[PDB]
Structures are given as structure tokens and as C-alpha cells.
């Protein structure tokens, strides 16, 4: 990847199971006679991570963006390998089984998917504002689901009905057609720039998405595409 | 001869409040609902919910 970066071309580098890289380092150190550190891990854990992750950076001539996959042993995030991996992370994406099984193909959970770029001084005031209005109605994970479950929605929830409708609309709208799955699901893929995303979600939270039922925000690129589908 | 008692089942018109100027009765139900019926019915249901859901999680 660094060859092409030196050529000036932006590169997307995927590392599958960087935790396995940590484990390989641990085994190499154990076989090399080095004393173990923490839970049997190599003493040179931080430096070994630095010598690899620091090459993934954006210089002036080019950039190497990385999208790694991390496997945590059991569910222990206190483990030294996930901790050292996370010390070199800028964003996390948490694909969820429930979202995947609800026919929404991009299973990126709106919650549990953070980023350090999501602040006004880089993305912009509007982007941060729209990203905060969304994920706020979902901040509860629609905790209203339990009250519906044990109350039959109580036959009336006032505003909660509107916030539930908006949250469901946004959850459906997060899906996007895949240009690589176009030959599988028979649907052209739409590429949505960040400006289109922020404008569409700003309008949806303002309320232009209202008066439109579900299954119309299921699988579309822009809010303009949703409007075109609605009028047709 | 000395005291009069009216065990009336219900009272309606009352020059004290009547329909116009009536205040006590106004929001009186909420005064005996938000902390009694309305909201509180859900308020105690939320206690049942969040407690029940964590009851299996501790098992």
C-alpha cells in the first residue's frame, strides 16, 4: 500500500483480525525466550503496534485509510490486545445481527458506532448538528419498545408515536444500495456524498419525511430519491 | 335540631366554582393522576419493566 501511497494515490487498506497479528507477536516472543508481559503477551506490544499502525497515516502527497477488523477473545475488552488495538483507532463500526436479519443490508448499528471526527471543528457545525439530532431519538435504542410490549402502546403515546415513526424511518433510511450487490439483488447502487447525507437527514428531521409511509425509505440513496419514489 | 347533614351522592353546580371561574376541579384529575393515575401507571410499569428485564440477566 505504501508504494501506491508514494505514487500519490489514496489507498484503502483492510487488515483482517489485527488481534491475530498481536497473537502472532505473542507467540513469536514466547518462542524467542522473551519474558511474558501482562497475560503472556509480548513485552514489545506497544512498539510492535506502533511500527505497523503508524505507517497508516495521511501525508501531504497521499493517504492510506485503514478499515481493520478486531476480534476480542471472549468479550473481554480489558484484554491487552484489544486495548493496544483501540489505542490506534479513529472510529468503530459495529455491525449488528438484528439489523442484518431485518433485511437492512448495511447492518451498521446507529449506536455503538462512534468516531473522533464527529465534532464541529472538522466535519462542520451542520454535520455535527444533524448527526446529534439523529442517534438522539435512537439514544434510548427506542426504549419505548418495552412500554409498547407491556402496554399495547397504551392505545396512545402522544409525541412518542411521532418519535417512534421518525426513528423507524431513519433506521430504514440508513440502508443504501450496493454497487457490488447490484447483480445479486437487481438494484443499481447509489453513491451518496456526505453533503447529500447531511442535507437529507436534516430535511428528514425537520419533517419532510413525514406524510410518507415506511417501505419508501427502505432502500434508496437520497431523500430526493425517496421523494421521487413517493410522487411516482 | 342543632346540626344538618346532607349525605348527597353527587354535587354539580356551585356558585363558588360552577363552570366559569371553576379552578379546583380544573386539573384536579391531573393533581390526582400525574402522581396518582396518569404517568404514575406507566411510572410504576417502567419499574416493573426495567426490573423484570434485569431479573433474567442476573440469572
Curated annotation (Swiss-Prot), chain A:
It is found in: Cell membrane. F-type ATPases have 2 components, CF(1) - the catalytic core - and CF(0) - the membrane proton channel. CF(1) has five subunits: alpha(3), beta(3), gamma(1), delta(1), epsilon(1). CF(0) has four main subunits: a(1), b(1), b'(1) and c(9-12). The chain holds residues 237 to 468 of 471 of the full protein. It comes from the Bacteria. Belongs to the ATPase alpha/beta chains family. This is ATP synthase subunit beta. Produces ATP from ADP in the presence of a proton gradient across the membrane. The catalytic sites are hosted primarily by the beta subunits.
Swiss-Prot record, chain B:
It is found in: Cell membrane. Residues 19-40 are annotated as: Disordered. It comes from the Bacteria. Belongs to the ATPase epsilon chain family. F-type ATPases have 2 components, CF(1) - the catalytic core - and CF(0) - the membrane proton channel. CF(1) has five subunits: alpha(3), beta(3), gamma(1), delta(1), epsilon(1). CF(0) has three main subunits: a, b and c. Produces ATP from ADP in the presence of a proton gradient across the membrane. This is ATP synthase epsilon chain. The lineage of its organism: Bacteria, Bacillati, Chloroflexota, Chloroflexia, Chloroflexales.
